[PDB]
Amino acid sequence: ISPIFQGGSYQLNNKSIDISSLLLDKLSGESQTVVMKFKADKPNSLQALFGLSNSKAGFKNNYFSIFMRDSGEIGVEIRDAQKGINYLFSRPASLWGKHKGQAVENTLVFVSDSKDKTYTMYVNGIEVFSETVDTFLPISNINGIDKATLGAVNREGKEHYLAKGSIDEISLFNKAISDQEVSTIPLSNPFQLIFQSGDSTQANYFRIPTLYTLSSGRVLSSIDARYGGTHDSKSKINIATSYSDDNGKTWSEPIFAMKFNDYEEQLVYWPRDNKLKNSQISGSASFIDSSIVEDKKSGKTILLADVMPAGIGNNNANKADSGFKEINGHYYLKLKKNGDNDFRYTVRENGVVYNETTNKPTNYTINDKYEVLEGGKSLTVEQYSVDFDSGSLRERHNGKQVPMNVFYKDSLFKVTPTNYIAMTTSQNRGESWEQFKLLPPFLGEKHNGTYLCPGQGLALKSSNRLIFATYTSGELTYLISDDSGQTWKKSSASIPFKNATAEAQMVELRDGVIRTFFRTTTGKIAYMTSRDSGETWSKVSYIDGIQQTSYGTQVSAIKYSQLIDGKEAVILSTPNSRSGRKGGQLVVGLVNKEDDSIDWKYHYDIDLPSYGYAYSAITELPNHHIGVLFEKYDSWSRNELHLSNVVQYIDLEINDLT
Ligand SMILES: O=S(=O)(O)CCNCc1cccc(Cl)c1
């Protein structure tokens, strides 16, 4: 249907605009839709875009507003004192501010539906909240409403929540338009989604993006598909992948590179209230932190991720145990049988489960999928599903049987409760992935394994060498293969922090010269250099000119193929901020051929300094554009947990950055 009101080209410069005469007497019925296209690249701390209010003395809490914060949060208030109603619905990190230095036109759709008693907010094609209430309050049913305002709320005759920005278009409808109708509304998005709520992964949440340009020109991406909110394990998380064959313009429906079946893949709205937001799927196995590389020699794509058995995160991860037993230069996966207090088994050659106390083999074997077989027959366990129907999180059997896996809670044989690294490969550039294999321990039998650095591995240009950075307490532990990832060795490089989350990414400055940039606990990004293709590593230095928080954030980095200002160039992606994960930048550095030092010459602001930017992935697209897939929110903040569709993709050109 048609708008009852339509206006545009409104400039909000800290002075409200009264549209009462134009709008108020057009409002009728109990259901309304607001469609508003607006820019705000210099927002005030807290500002209202739109208000309906009782402006009379004594009725300061009788109003409806659509408001935003300079954090990028969007919300509404719906208030009527006489009715005793004070609704406040919102979601952090819902907005864009700037893109390529130009103010972004956000498309906001707010639906107030009296029939379903539900308020729903979409921004830029993304539903950011949908709230059902017992007692519905139609927005124009507020006692004594006498003002319709743009860029403030009129309370007791004064302008509250004064806005800075513009409303290029605003329409109102005396109808609650359908989800279908919403999706036909044209958008002006500066970004794309590769992974998103409702896709093939059926995860409502995603974290830890990666990007990698394959030699055929295909761009591949991997990500944590996170089911139990945005929590790091413990949770259910699979590793999903998608690829683009047209320079990032479009992307394939995701598939899984690594998945477990002990818990159902469920699209779940995770509670965001302070009482329940720390609810955590607690009995599921999971993957976390993926990294990609391509091997010139075989042509295979190789993906690694951390693996966690059921219940297990990095907090309850058995340090002081690798999960393997050393038996004469060889490492065998340890197992514990249902009922025993110790790990009395190992998985020897051909997956034969072997009793260590009597040195007899059992009739149990472990297949290539880490599934348990008895006498060649597939054992099963019953799957779990989760729900908050009772009010709190419940994890319960759902009737479906799935293959018994040693990483599962209900398994007859269980691996050691600690962190492992798995590897899978693709022969068809990400169209399918093999069953993963665990990597062996590198730091000894009684050292719990290292943590994979998410993002990219490094494929050295002039050899067959493959390297994946990993971290542990007191060092970076590079994993090195010269035979297409069939065998790996480690190269240890000491760093001056104990228990840092030293997420590290590498660039090749020139043949055999690797610089690694990594996250620290110092508020500055660090780096070290190898000049022998990763055999040995320099001492640690720090970058000036970029700030991180004390706890730090992952940094992504590439070596750009083309000269810039006549020099070799490296591009870093990172939040630039000592307060939180915001102020995203790409920083372009020019290499000094004399000494391999880097002049950080250009800083490109991804969006506003106050808007969220966390983990990121950068790649040089085959057309020499830059692709960026990143968490567009603060993934540290306890106020921004469990947000949907915040991992977003943008395309940039080098001239945009300079
Ligand atoms: O800096 S963040 O807190 O946003 C993400 C830190 N992830 C570290 C990790 C790695 C492997 C397993 C687990 Cl459980 C946690």
UniProtKB/Swiss-Prot annotation:
It comes from the Bacteria. It is an enzyme of class 3 (hydrolase). Keywords: Glycosidase, Hydrolase, Repeat, Signal. The keyword Hydrolase applies. BNR repeats lie at residues 242-253, 424-435, 479-490, 528-539. The active site is at D232 (proton acceptor), E503, Y615 (nucleophile). Pfam families: BNR, BNR_2, Sialidase. Its EC number is 3.2.1.18. One of its GO terms (molecular function) is exo-alpha-sialidase activity. InterPro entries: BNR_rpt, ConA-like_dom_sf, Glyco_hydro_33_N, Sialidase, Sialidase_fam, Sialidase_sf, Trans_sialidase_dom3. GO terms for biological process: ganglioside catabolic process; oligosaccharide catabolic process. One of its GO terms (cellular component) is membrane. Substrate binds at R207, R519, R581. It catalyses: Hydrolysis of alpha-(2->3)-, alpha-(2->6)-, alpha-(2->8)- glycosidic linkages of terminal sialic acid residues in oligosaccharides, glycoproteins, glycolipids, colominic acid and synthetic substrates. Belongs to the glycosyl hydrolase 33 family. This is Sialidase B. It comes from Streptococcus pneumoniae serotype 4 (strain ATCC BAA-334 / TIGR4). The lineage of its organism: Bacteria, Bacillati, Bacillota, Bacilli, Lactobacillales. The gene is nanB.
